[PDB]
Write a protein that binds this ligand. Structure first.
Ligand SMILES: C[C@H](O)CC(=O)OP(=O)(O)OC[C@H]1O[C@@H](n2cnc3c(N)ncnc32)[C@H](O)[C@@H]1O
Ligand SMILES: C[C@H](O)CC(=O)OP(=O)(O)OC[C@H]1O[C@@H](n2cnc3c(N)ncnc32)[C@H](O)[C@@H]1O
Lengths: 474, 474
């Protein structure tokens, strides 16, 4: 194959740095013919499954139950059809019966390097070798975004249980960038951060797309201009936004920089296994030789053809601790296999990830993702930057209830101008989704902003009824 | 000398682990005759000063101004008398004139690994080699606290600009412990942490002494018992507490574990250069071959005899990036040179560090440190766990104004019992300090707790006058 440092268990040269003129960290692995890579992926898949059968009674029990033995993995078609998907509920049960890390940990207790998790929570017990595998994978993909040694990288996501921040930091460290782990979560942090970004002038920023928006309002409230932060790029994970039309454009305009989309799941660190590149800057590429991504039909867990929508199912190819083999994301995406501007021979998620299938709600037989509402509103000049979707999953909904913020300039323009925006927001959303949308305007900057993931859906039956009844009276 | 890995610039074997039966990480460096170590320290001091003269125009300019050349460093007595102390104000000025890291950075820009700082803030630009020097120094000292490979270490301090959390994490990583960087700072964290500590059962905890107290109230509010967290120890830095009589005893009782004191300054990472050991568990030892600590008379910056109080002045012996040479802490301590129970041949701070000299206030010609008030109150069964000291530095104070919380059981006992506590708190404080103390009781759990450093002094002239006038009327 000629694939750079292709071995299981993986063991990367910590001193390797690509030549300054190279677009790719690993030219072979990244640009080789896709059919050549798929051969080696299957080869690795066999190694991983044999490794899990040997060290994980979770996989040994699960596979035996579905009638699977690693010797039956003889093609990628055998993998999708014979190998049962892992659910997050299966991990929880394994952790409850085999505490703290479950019967899929594989490595001895003495190998565990870092303890992280979800916020029943699942604990991540990551071995020393996996932490190195994650740092190398992430430095590689960050290089793909045009981030370089010596660049100041601001990691502005909470450093706690959450894998996002640690993963971007490990990549920055391995990339030989100046890692700036400012973090997030504490009151007073954002006001101080904007001063640090104005002083330090970083080449790159990491966090959630929501935080980047909130930080520009803080920069402006703090009489600082966020275009003067010297940013060449901002790269995000954690939620949709970075591949959302009006959201991506708002962030790139506010900072005068490029926006990159990345991120699968925390269970799937190196989570940057799905990430956009400097040239293929829309959506994300599936870095197949790091983690094998399958976009599947949720009805049978088999790959959907390219150009079709489905759910990402992921498999670690370079992890010995808590390896995930065919973990069901529960997310919705579309994947294609056409030529990429960067020249990387990987499948792509051209519109990134739409959201979690469970987050979707139905109004008059029409399926709606919260990200579709966020996209339509952000493409409006009069929109204030925040909204809430008020629903009920207990009874059928005839209309969409929205609490939308107008801009301070729309507010300053008077009652008639506010009313003109409320009606135009309602119409736009109706034209986009094909559903009746009731809009209630709230005061500018009244809706809570976040430095983490935006939770815009209020699924309470009493809140829904109170709002509908109030909107019927007005 | 036979000192393990004694070299400048330092370059530690990342695979070294002491034998399981050893009390010391480095038997020679830690237990050698003090006069033998002081010879090699002076030798290193010469190397460091030559290194700074060559790479830092900040030190070249400062030393030339004080009439000092590194060739004049011919004894430890030459060091204290000839070498001018560095002030935090000098670092700020150097950073403003030579942004971002100042003219004392020494290493090239390309060597900077991590960016941290203070919260005018000073930026820390720490090189890759220094980060390794810090991780090794900290693993060594944590081993001294009886912390071992495979032990689950909860790092519960904010992961941001602040060096404390990163320093404990780097030590845990190098110690081959299971590093658990939960962090601090965000609302909802403490309630979730107590659940993680009950589930995970860590051998060690890191944070501020204030946070450990707050976390026990959260554990109890959450109907969990903090003695059931499996803790063998809690080790703290950031503020006094861990060497404060009633505070140390309250924490050890609440958790059923040992408490260790550590920590100099963030500018002085590896900040654990002052730290207690499993056997010398009261106060802190000065790990002289890591950082050279001098307890000086603030009037002349010369060492005070053992058994006398003074200000810690620190010098890095194993740092190439932003090396600190005779940095004035502005803190107050007492140092002695008697035999230590662990058998380490180091000077000791038997009562740790009392506080920042600037934090001290005067009432009727009597000098008081906020930690003396904290100590007296914490040694009272009826004390609720929080208080505020209300002062004025604008006019002379005749009496001490205190806002003290009683316990919920003292409150439930009625008005007479609350009044009996208010008078007894006043008397105790008067007997301790020798000053009139006016006590106002506040509602139990009304005073804000913290996961960081406790700021108990309110130095406002209007607040002081309002309180005195209110206390004169009652
Ligand atoms: C540790 C990383 O930050 C990823 C992460 O947030 O892990 P979590 O377990 O906390 O959450 C994963 C879920 O967030 C979403 N999710 C994560 N990244 C997404 C993206 N780029 N686009 C659309 N949705 C995305 C997506 O629904 C994914 O399944
Ligand atoms: C990065 C480390 O946590 C140390 C730290 O907090 O660095 P900072 O620069 O943020 O603050 C240093 C000051 O906190 C105090 N300070 C720090 N540790 C102390 C202790 N153990 N006992 C008494 N006072 C102590 C002491 O006054 C010291 O000068």
């Amino acid at each position: 194959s000629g694939m750079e440092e292709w071995n299981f268990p993986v063991e990367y040269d910590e001193n390797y740095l690509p030549p300054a003129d190279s677009r790719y960290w690993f030219p072979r692995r990244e640009t080789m013919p896709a059919a050549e890579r798929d051969k080696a992926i299957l080869g690795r898949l066999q190694q991983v499954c044999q490794y899990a059968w040997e060290h994980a009674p979770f996989y040994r029990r699960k596979w035996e139950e579905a009638g699977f033995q690693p010797s039956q993995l003889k093609s990628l078609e055998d993998f999708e059809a014979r190998v049962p998907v892992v659910k997050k509920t299966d991990l929880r049960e394994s952790q409850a019966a085999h505490p703290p890390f479950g019967d899929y940990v594989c490595v001895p207790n003495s190998e565990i390097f870092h303890v992280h998790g979800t916020s029943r929570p699942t604990a991540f017990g990551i071995g020393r070798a996996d932490w190195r595998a994650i740092a190398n994978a992430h430095a590689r993909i960050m290089w793909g975004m045009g981030i370089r040694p010596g660049d100041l990288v601001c990691v502005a996501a909470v450093f706690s249980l959450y894998m996002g921040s640690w993963g971007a930091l490990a990549g920055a460290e391995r990339l030989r960038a100046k890692a700036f782990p400012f973090g997030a979560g504490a009151p007073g942090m954002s006001a101080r951060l904007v001063q640090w970004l104005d002083t330090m002038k970083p080449a790159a920023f990491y966090g959630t797309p929501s935080y980047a928006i909130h930080l520009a309002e803080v920069a402006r409230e703090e009489k600082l201009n966020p275009r003067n932060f010297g940013l060449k790029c901002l790269f995000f994970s954690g939620e949709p936004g970075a591949s959302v039309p009006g959201v991506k454009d708002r962030i790139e305009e506010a900072y005068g920089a490029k926006v990159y989309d990345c991120g699968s799941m925390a269970e799937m660190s190196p989570f940057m296994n799905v990430a956009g590149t400097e040239q293929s800057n829309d959506g994300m590429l599936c870095w197949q030789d790091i983690i094998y991504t399958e976009v599947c039909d949720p009805a049978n867990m088999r790959r959907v053809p390219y150009g079709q929508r489905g759910t990402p199912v992921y498999t670690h190819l370079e992890r010995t601790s808590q390896p995930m083999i065919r973990l069901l994301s529960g997310d919705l995406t579309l994947w294609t296999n056409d030529e990429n501007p960067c020249g990387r021979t990987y499948p792509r998620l051209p519109q990134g990830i739409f959201g979690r299938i469970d987050d979707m709600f139905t109004i008059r037989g029409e399926n709606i993702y919260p990200s579709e509402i966020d996209a339509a509103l952000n493409q409006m000049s009069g929109y204030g930057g925040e909204h809430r979707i008020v629903i009920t999953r207990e009874s059928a909904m005839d209309e969409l209830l929205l609490r939308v913020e107008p801009s301070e300039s729309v507010h300053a323009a008077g009652a008639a101008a506010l009313e003109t925006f409320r009606t135009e927001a309602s119409h736009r959303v109706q034209t986009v989704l094909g559903v009746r949308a009731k809009v209630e305007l709230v005061a500018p900057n009244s809706i809570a902003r976040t430095d983490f993931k935006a939770r815009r859906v209020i699924d309470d039956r009493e809140v829904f009824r109170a709002l509908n009844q109030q909107l019927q009276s007005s």
